[PDB]
Amino acid sequence: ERTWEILKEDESGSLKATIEDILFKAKRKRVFEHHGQVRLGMMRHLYVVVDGSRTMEDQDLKPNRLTCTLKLLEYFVEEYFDQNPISQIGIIVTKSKRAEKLTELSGNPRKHITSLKKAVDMTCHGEPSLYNSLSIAMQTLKHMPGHTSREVLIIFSSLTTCDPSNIYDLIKTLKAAKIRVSVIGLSAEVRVCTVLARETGGTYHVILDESHYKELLTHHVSPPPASSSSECSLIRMGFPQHTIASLSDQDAKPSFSMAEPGLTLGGYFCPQCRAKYCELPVECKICGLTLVSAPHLARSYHHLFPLDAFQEIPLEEYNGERFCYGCQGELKDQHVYVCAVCQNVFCVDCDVFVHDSLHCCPGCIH
Amino acid sequence: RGLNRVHLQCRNLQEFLGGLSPGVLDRLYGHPATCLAVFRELPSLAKNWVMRMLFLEQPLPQAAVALWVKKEFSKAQEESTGLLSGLRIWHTQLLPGGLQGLILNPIFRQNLRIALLGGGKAWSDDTSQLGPDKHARDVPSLDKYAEERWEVVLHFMVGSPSAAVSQDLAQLLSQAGLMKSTEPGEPPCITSAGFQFLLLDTPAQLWYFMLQYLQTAQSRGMDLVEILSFLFQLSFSTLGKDYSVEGMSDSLLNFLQHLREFGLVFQRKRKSRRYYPTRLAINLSSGVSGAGGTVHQPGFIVVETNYRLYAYTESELQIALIALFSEMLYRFPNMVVAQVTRESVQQAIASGITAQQIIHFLRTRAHPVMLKQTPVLPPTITDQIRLWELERDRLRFTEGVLYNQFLSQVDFELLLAHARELGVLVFENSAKRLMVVTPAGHSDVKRFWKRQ
Amino acid sequence: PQEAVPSAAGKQVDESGTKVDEYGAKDYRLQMPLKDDHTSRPLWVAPDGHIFLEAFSPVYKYAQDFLVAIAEPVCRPTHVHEYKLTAYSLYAAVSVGLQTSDITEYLRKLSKTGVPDGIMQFIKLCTVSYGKVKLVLKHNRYFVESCHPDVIQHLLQDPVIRECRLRNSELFDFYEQMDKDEEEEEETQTVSFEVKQEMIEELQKRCIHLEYPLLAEYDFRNDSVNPDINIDLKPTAVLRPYQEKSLRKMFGNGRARSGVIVLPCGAGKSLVGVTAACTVRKRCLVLGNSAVSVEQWKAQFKMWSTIDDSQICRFTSDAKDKPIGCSVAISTYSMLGHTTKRSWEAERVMEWLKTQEWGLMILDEVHTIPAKMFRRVLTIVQAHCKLGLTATLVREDDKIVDLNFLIGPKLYEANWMELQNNGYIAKVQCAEVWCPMSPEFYREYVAIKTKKRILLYTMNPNKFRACQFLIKFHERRNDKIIVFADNVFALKEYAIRLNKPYIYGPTSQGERMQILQNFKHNPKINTIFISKVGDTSFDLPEANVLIQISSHGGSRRQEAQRLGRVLRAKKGMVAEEYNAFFYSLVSQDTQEMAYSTKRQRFLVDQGYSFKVITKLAGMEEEDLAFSTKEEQQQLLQKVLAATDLDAEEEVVA
């Protein structure tokens, strides 16, 4: 007997029209987090584990957990490749006390997202089997090279899981295998997953809101840190140049990529096996030599030397120009950002866009 | 009612100038601003090619120019080509050996060039070194004044009190066919075209209203080219800056007085030689207000799926317009509530208003909260609004001459062949040997029927 | 005097001579004084009781709850909502414990305009006396109670009321169970006295006349004298949140708060009623308009309650009845509200029923019962608690006097949006196939001024071909679909040519059940044809799509009632545009178009999504009947050769 009277004017005079001013911070956000100059698992094999159990039908979020999960998964899949084309993805669904590898080890969002679209039709059935899921995953990761960061991300919806044997078998194996596992839980903290994640070197987090769900996923987009226990390798890599059918396709037959059915007349050949690949980067399914484009390498070098947060202040007390450096414009906002090194004037968009998207400060390049 | 309902033929710049004489257009192209107005109105197809060709005096071959656009878009490029040539912008010149080279009218070329870079005149603009004017007028005061003036003209069509206008302007409203002369003394009355105009948006309204003024301009002895060039210079003017009436012909002075009375320009006094152009004049161009609430001023009609209209408007004019096609339910100080219904929309339809006018009228005035969605008007409303006219716009009338019951099929096939020969065939029935021909062929075919 | 006639029937505040402007709108700019905070105040309080809300306002959440708790909902489109104040809506707010000051203050605070004095007067008239006092019935003791002694002191000054009070006290309890001794806790805000058993009937008139209607509440739990039948819900019964709140609204205080509950067609209405009966655990009387409801309740009780065939008994002249050892009498109003005995079976049952004291009365169709029948029934049974179940708050028999006050305030209202947002009721695609009239049928349509015209709009090939396609489409989707029509020959000719099941009155129960079972459970029969009998209780099965072969028809509400009665959410399809569909087929330029228009309007008024159809893919791209002029002619001649009787409206029974 309180909801029709729950407005701010229920027991106040000024709240009759200042109610949305008193409760004005109702829907906003402001994303930022820390960083560190530590080794990163730039070569990344991340596998996604998603509950396929009846509990995924619950409406803890706006739509059922399944729809909200798949919605954010697609977005996460996109940015994961976008921020690391070198890495690869795979998906496993934990249904009927069993686990089904929705997607194999690959780096093609086309196939991965296509699988998601189709996976929207899945049937939430039975209880989850964390042991079966980790079995299929580890069985696959066993064959992956030690230097490639073998990681798994788990999305847990239920609280009870059917394991055919104590998961300590897998955790002891995973720890010895140096594989890393992280888990994202829905509405609750489970000891099983917490111990599993903390012991395995990953982290257990719980979803609060779709924004929090993105906030957590955002952290998993950045490559994990690496220790000296992982193989510090000197992996062989190919940088094949694109080659069209320039000579009227002469002595250059069109061919389908190892992964694709599209017969491409021009593209990237394998310097190791001369295979035809329409896209790059692509792993040589018939050689083991990975082929990567020179710009994709530089695309990740920001993680090696990222920017630092700029000095924030409510006013340009330093009395720089009335026009914000970088992007020209008036200091219309009573909050200013100043680079520690170059000390130029930066605005809200500069601190956000330059540090989170440009990753380079103009005055530091000078 | 031998033909369909009278429609307000909205003729953009192309349709209007497309009928003018080349010398008139050449005189018009005399000013740099007139060229820019024409140029900016061109489709992006023409817009780029003209800019690309502006710096050449060599007749580039028709084929090479046409081969600048991809195979599939070359067909759409023909539209811009037909326009540029039809608008005298493109004139063919012959390369050695008679090849079809293309050249832009040098006057237009030179004025666009003088528009982009210095020329003998500095855009025909100057400050006259005068200081800040007496009784300074502010930009918002200019807008409101222009708005008030425009509202007064719309109010005059609505026939509301205090709508003060000159009889020559009231006459023009009747002369243009907007205010019907159904009664002596010209009491407030409106034609289908006038209602369509009332529901039309401000820029297209002002544009077509001024086109009617121009259609009567030489009947009124005013200078078409001069007024047009002046109007284009005004469209390229600035709100806050001052402009002078120094060196303006009496024809321009008469028009300027109308232009002032019309609220497109603000003057210190009717006799003053310095003025400030209003937002309406700068925005006076053949363009579109938008698919939702107007960019310049937001909409106020909250159209709802239950056909309920919640117009956050105080304006008796806007309210009275809504009453034309919708049945009004309540009047509240800050907002008005009405509902669209078959009867009220059939009133608009019977008054000769295409449902698209209502749809667009509501769209252009759709409250900003209704935005942020692809369809601003729910499909059910859009469909039923159209369905109401499609219910009662199935009967289509057409005046013609019928040829029937000939002596044989040879007569029918001969008359049909003659109708086909002259292209005067409207419709025919080959089973009963019936043919309908345009009325122009009435005498020709009636007399031929005696000869065949 | 028990209906609280003045605010309900007199409606003092309804304007006359309204200042309607030239545009036809009510000019309330002067009546509703302008007030500031046009952007922060989300309400408009029109002097005619209508209220408007902004769904985009920042306080919409609270303002919606506020209007939902105070005013009847009218329309709830995406950006604006409409609500209407009524005595019953206001009394429901008062019974919840809301004060006239709080209501007036929050209204004035949320209204963009000052509240009109006429509405403020209506608020006073409907809040000061409307429910300040309660009539408790615990331990068979009629205790009159009010939160404020001020109200009862005034009431107690009435000499007739004083003659009703009984001097009695209530005891405590022993250490075996001294909670009844600890029930002396919270005697603050609590003052009550017993009234003589027989004075209640007269005292009610006196209190309502005195402007102090009694909120009657039956303490079924502590009532020791009326024996319990150990009634309990089967584990199959799971309460949905709206059902749980509806029961919470009723049993929130602990006693059965008598009143009317409104649940839209398709809700687990029976589950709420069975739960209420299972909660009361006392003998219950149930009333419906047909023996069908009686056995429909009985079957639903069997599936959700422990009550046996020795305990559920039917009592309706259509069937044999069993007073001996009955525990739940389920019965028809027209039997009980008789003017004179129907039979010796009325001597058997009505004298017996007049003698029993049912602990709870459940009305399944109170929104359809006339004042006289309801007044007779209420006078005869004299049940300790009454619960009114309704499909819609506005009753076709409401007319001048809102009989709802006889039962009490509205207890709960399940919002269409909450049911759709939670899938309890599917989103129904309302659509009308406006078929162009055929030239030949147009000859006969204008020439046949008599009602034989009905077949012409019904048998148009365009209507048949579209019907055939959509049926085959819904069959391809495997949607359960039912086809209804106003005429024998039409429905026969359709179902026969379509080679689909058709049900009529002569259809024997086994022949009927063969179809029903093969439709309800066998996935083969996707489409079935049902006669005009479907307009009423004919044990219609469950379906996901419904098509009206004729948009000609009766009451819009009865059509809407039928639509919800049959339509059910298609399992697993709730993500689609719609998971329920309704169609009504219309002949352009015919008498069907008005009922079509009025249905279209009434649907959008009720908030249902609507569309119009003329042609869709397959309507010509597929093999459909009457594709040739001759077959169209044969159909039209068979229609013309059919008598007026075969063309007239099919009987509903």
Ligand SMILES: [Zn+2]
């Ligand atoms: Zn290779």
Ligand SMILES: [Zn+2]
């Ligand atoms: Zn810097």
